[PDB]
């Protein structure tokens, strides 16, 4: 019928490589292929979660603008290499890995001490090179989960802890195509093919489902469319150690808080009955003892209480 749309379903997944996949959605109505494809591409490129290296501690180094004896690379180059380490964490949002190596040769990701909940998807990733036989390196690497891009400058520490900019997104690129679908008895249905390139740390189907869930949660708002003062000012007047006659004069004027008192000027107090110059001087003295004065102006008093 006219008010009866055919709902797309996930048909097949083609794992071209460990980091390259294709996902097919079928069938689609006229025009829905591009509508779904562009939104899915934006969400996939924007909001997928992942893990990244955020902190590194190396035994012998103090900062990143330095060198280590027997190591081919600078500390900055080692940090840049560690910025591209792909790690999958199975049970928590933070982990610390340990690396120890010695002897001439390349130090890669396969030398990281094994952990139960940590998986290395590219063991051949080169970290550094040791060029001397009596040379060794040991470091601790912090990995945590997040989304987006968090530079180290936006987010004390002891000397020797090196911060690393975090790129949490596991998706490298997204492409999509809309083709004709050979359905049983119609020739006006489409098929959406999404080509996904990642770093190998997220499954394509769960990425698609997560993007769809985010889109639906954002849609549910459209589906149902509808429309401190300083503490000292809040203290009572009797907190001041005023004399009996001064307290009586202030009570006769209906002044119960310091905020009420400080807004009154000297002339008004002087014109009030039963208040001489001595009592006004005493009031000024006790206010000055707390760093206050007469003649202050306040907006929106009393303080809504």
């Amino acid at each position: 019928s006219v008010t009866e749309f055919l709902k797309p379903r996930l048909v097949d997944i083609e794992q071209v490589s460990s980091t390259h996949a294709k996902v097919t959605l079928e069938p689609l109505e006229r025009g829905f292929g591009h509508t779904l494809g562009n939104a899915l591409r934006r969400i996939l490129l924007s909001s997928m979660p992942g893990c990244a290296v955020t902190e590194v501690e190396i035994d012998g180094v103090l900062h990143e603008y330095s060198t280590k004896e027997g190591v081919q690379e600078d500390i900055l180059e080692i940090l840049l290499n560690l910025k591209g380490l792909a790690v999958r964490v199975q049970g928590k949002d933070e982990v610390i890995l340990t690396l120890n190596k010695s002897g001439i040769g390349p130090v890669t990701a396969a030398d990281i001490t094994h952990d139960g909940d940590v998986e290395i998807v590219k063991p051949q990733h080169v970290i550094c090179h040791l060029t001397d036989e009596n040379a060794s390196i040991s470091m601790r690497i912090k990995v945590q989960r997040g989304r987006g891009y968090v530079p180290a400058s936006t987010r004390e520490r002891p000397i020797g802890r090196l911060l690393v900019d975090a790129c949490y997104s596991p998706v490298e690129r997204i492409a999509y195509n809309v083709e004709a679908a050979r359905v049983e008895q119609r020739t006006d249905l489409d098929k959406l093919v999404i080509e996904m390139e990642t770093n190998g740390t997220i499954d394509p189907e769960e990425a698609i489902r997560r993007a769809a869930t985010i889109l639906a949660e954002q849609l549910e708002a459209f589906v149902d469319l509808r429309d401190e003062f300083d503490p000292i000012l809040l203290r009572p007047v009797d907190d001041l150690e005023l004399t009996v006659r001064s307290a009586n004069c202030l009570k006769a004027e209906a002044i119960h808080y310091i905020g009420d008192l400080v807004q009154r000027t000297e002339v008004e107090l002087l014109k009030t009955p039963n208040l001489g110059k001595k009592s006004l001087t005493e009031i000024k003295d006790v206010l000055a003892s707390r760093g206050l004065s007469l003649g202050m102006r306040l907006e929106n008093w009393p303080p809504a209480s």
Binding site: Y65, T67, E69, Q72, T131, D132
Partner: protein
Amino acid sequence: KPLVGTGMERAVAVDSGVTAVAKRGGVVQYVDASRIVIKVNEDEMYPGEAGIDIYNLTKYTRSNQNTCINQMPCVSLGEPVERGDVLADGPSTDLGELAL
């Protein structure tokens, strides 16, 4: 490196003196991020000397314009070198070519 050039990059890189250039040929005996030791060839040695050349590299040094001067090796352990070859790149240099 530019990836579209004119052919004058190597001359500017070498004649500026910002790189480390081998004085004599030989083999890379020691390589590190701060120093390079070359084992000189037998026929290029003087009598009564130990045939090694030592190059200490410049690391993170301030320039007249408050910028960084840093040298990085571009040779591996045990590889042959000749007189005039580039051993380490200076700032804005990539394998002996100007890279601005």
